């Protein structure tokens with residue numbers, strides 16, 4: 001649950017992402033894959049990537065980064081009223097991709113890391129607080145659907 005002022009911070013930060021969605025999406029996935037190499041094994045189309053240089057050179061990884069952040073941005077713009085947008089993603093990630101909630105924690109922290117890396121000194125403590133709360137809400141509502149499905 002976020003206040004109006006917190007949502008305003010989230011959507012202000014998101015403007016930074018929308019200026020370069022592919023570059024942000026690429027770096028988020030690279031941070032996930034290099035920090036948590038077990039996550040790469042869930043992607044049949046990226047498991048061939050052995051080095052970060054190959055990851056950086058992969059145009060399909062940048063494409064998928066655009067898909068991921070476009071979906072997340074659509075959810076964030078609903079300011080919590082995201083049941084219709086979130087349900088299909090919860091279902092596909094639990095039942096088809098088999099993504100444990102832990103990996104959603106990993107990618108949430110990766111987003112925070114990338115924002116500081118690309119905007120050092122321009123991602124203030126209030127903005128980090130609000131973005132963190134928004135990603136916690138996203139993860140918590142996914143977790144509720146995971147529990148319904150019995151997925152661990």
Ligand code: HEM
Nearest residue numbers: 039042043044045067068071072089092097099103104107
């Ligand atoms: C912010 C969190 C995430 C968002 C918004 C997101 C979004 C998406 C979307 C929109 C798709 C394509 C449609 C679909 O299959 O539902 C997708 C596919 C997929 N996601 Fe995610 N995802 C997220 C996190 C993760 C994480 C953490 C993992 C694994 C560590 C993951 C694994 C996958 C896989 C394996 C696919 C299929 C890729 C393919 O072969 O095309 N997702 N995701």
